[PDB]
Design an enzyme around this catalytic site. Structure first.
Site, PDB file in Angstrom:
ATOM      1  N   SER A   1      10.600 -10.652 -14.964  1.00  0.00           N
ATOM      2  CA  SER A   1      10.223  -9.249 -15.186  1.00  0.00           C
ATOM      3  C   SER A   1      10.556  -8.348 -13.984  1.00  0.00           C
ATOM      4  O   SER A   1      10.437  -7.111 -14.143  1.00  0.00           O
ATOM      5  CB  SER A   1       8.780  -9.097 -15.567  1.00  0.00           C
ATOM      6  OG  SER A   1       8.556  -9.465 -16.911  1.00  0.00           O
TER       7      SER A   1
ATOM      8  N   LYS B   1      12.779  -5.215 -14.519  1.00  0.00           N
ATOM      9  CA  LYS B   1      12.350  -3.965 -15.156  1.00  0.00           C
ATOM     10  C   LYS B   1      12.417  -2.778 -14.193  1.00  0.00           C
ATOM     11  O   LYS B   1      12.560  -1.644 -14.656  1.00  0.00           O
ATOM     12  CB  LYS B   1      10.953  -4.172 -15.728  1.00  0.00           C
ATOM     13  CG  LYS B   1      10.982  -5.100 -16.985  1.00  0.00           C
ATOM     14  CD  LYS B   1       9.687  -5.679 -17.386  1.00  0.00           C
ATOM     15  CE  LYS B   1       9.789  -6.638 -18.551  1.00  0.00           C
ATOM     16  NZ  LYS B   1       8.659  -7.498 -18.824  1.00  0.00           N
TER      17      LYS B   1
END
Ligand SMILES: OC[C@H]1O[C@H](O[C@H]2[C@H](O)[C@@H](O)[C@H](OCCCCCCC3CCCCC3)O[C@@H]2CO)[C@H](O)[C@@H](O)[C@@H]1O
Length: 265
Positions: free
Chosen positions: A45, A48
């Site tokens: 992640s 992002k």
């Protein structure tokens, strides 16, 4: 705590895995600490933040608006959609999608935004256009978190990620407002930010995005410094350890402790 490099080594010994780390001055790009800084690690992640840098670049060019509302369908959702699952009737703005992706790690928000920048290939092209010739996104959420041993898909290096974050936050490639927005989204992380502040000494700034894989990986991209200032970028990735998530977390925290106790290098 030991010196930072000594602690990084101890973490590899205890985890039986590879650690990659860079510590860099945010203002100037001075590298203070490098460990496996040119080796590949899954982004998870942490991608992002780069994604929303590409979104902001489109806003600055007049090709996107943070206000624009996207109406999406339940069939568009993937695993872990804490914000986006709540807005099937009313949609979310582009800026809300970035806030959900960065501050809540919302996977469906990230995939909706990825579409707008041309998918993994479009995001990779953006990276090449800002001079990052190493980072690559290949897959969508959630397959990009698979973290298979030896797989180059969906990877960065600590050095490349730190340089790219610095470019997005400070190099005036993004407008002033966009730089300020990207920073604020990281300041606002709800997944790890509050927990990290509850164990940081008084006076230390934190802004961050974390990533995780169940297959023995973990990472964080952070801004950290004393006197309530975002003095340094710190990028830490873990891979190929069989250890518990708790022990991954504790070892990253231990590297942070070593930095805090030995800051003036
Ligand atoms: O002398 C320095 C400090 O030593 C301790 O602080 C500890 C703190 O009690 C502990 O909770 C933290 O854990 C580290 C938590 C790491 C937080 C972030 C880790 C991430 C995010 C940022 C980049 C690196 C990784 O370590 C520091 C340093 O020993 C004392 O509690 C504090 O009074 C004193 O000012």
């Amino acid at each position: 705590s030991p010196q930072p490099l000594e602690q990084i080594k101890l973490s590899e010994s205890q985890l039986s895995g590879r650690v990659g780390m860079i510590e860099m001055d945010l203002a100037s790009g001075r590298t203070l600490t490098a460990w496996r800084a040119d080796e590949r690690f899954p982004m998870m992640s942490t991608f992002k933040v780069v994604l929303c840098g590409a979104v902001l670049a489109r806003v600055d060019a007049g090709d996107e608006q943070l206000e624009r509302k996207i109406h999406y369908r339940q069939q568009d959702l993937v695993d872990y959609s804490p914000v986006s699952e709540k807005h099937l009737a009313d949609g979310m703005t582009v800026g809300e999608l970035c806030a959900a992706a960065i501050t809540m790690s919302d996977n469906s928000a990230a995939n909706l935004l990825l579409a707008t920048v041309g998918g993994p290939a479009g995001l990779t092209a953006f990276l090449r256009q800002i001079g990052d010739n190493v980072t690559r996104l290949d897959r969508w959420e959630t397959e990009l978190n698979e973290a298979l041993p030896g797989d180059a898909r969906d990877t960065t290096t600590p050095a490349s990620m730190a340089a790219t974050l610095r470019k997005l936050l400070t190099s005036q490639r993004l407008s002033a407002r966009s730089q300020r927005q990207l920073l604020q989204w990281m300041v606002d992380d709800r997944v790890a930010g509050p927990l990290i502040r509850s164990v940081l000494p008084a006076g230390w700034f934190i802004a961050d995005k974390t990533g995780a894989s169940e297959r023995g990986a973990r990472g964080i991209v952070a801004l950290l410094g004393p006197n309530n200032k975002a003095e340094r970028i710190v990028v830490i990735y873990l891979r190929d350890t069989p250890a518990s998530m708790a022990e991954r977390n504790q070892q990253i925290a231990g590297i942070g402790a070593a930095l805090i106790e030995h800051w003036q290098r």
